[PDB]
């Protein structure tokens, strides 16, 4: 916790399902929460996990 803050720590917010014990998830992509495909560009209902 340095002056100005430390930002080398990241975590996933949104997921399509639950995980299994002793299994990892490192691949990143875009997540769609509505009825319209995100088309790979950040927009409404399109947030980086």
């Amino acid at each position: 916790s340095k002056v100005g803050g430390n930002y080398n720590y990241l975590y996933r917010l949104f997921r399509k399902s639950n995980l299994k014990p002793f299994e990892r998830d490192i691949s990143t992509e875009i997540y769609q929460a509505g009825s319209t495909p995100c088309n790979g560009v950040e927009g409404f209902n399109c947030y980086f996990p």
């Binding site: 014990p21 002793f22 299994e23 990892r24």
Partner: protein, 49 residues
């Protein structure tokens, strides 16, 4: 659970094109904790020029 279990056994044969009738077991050899989700596989061969 991530663990990759491998067994093996070695035995010669005198045949042309078949699977002979008989009994033989397998024994454990080596285990590595790769721990990657897996759903497919393939195989590689060799050719003589």
């Amino acid at each position: 659970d991530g663990y990759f279990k491998i067994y093996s056994k070695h035995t010669p044969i005198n045949l042309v094109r078949d699977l002979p009738q008989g009994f033989s077991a397998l024994e454990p050899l080596v285990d590595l904790p790769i721990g990657i989700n897996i759903t497919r596989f393939q195989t590689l061969l060799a050719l003589h020029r």
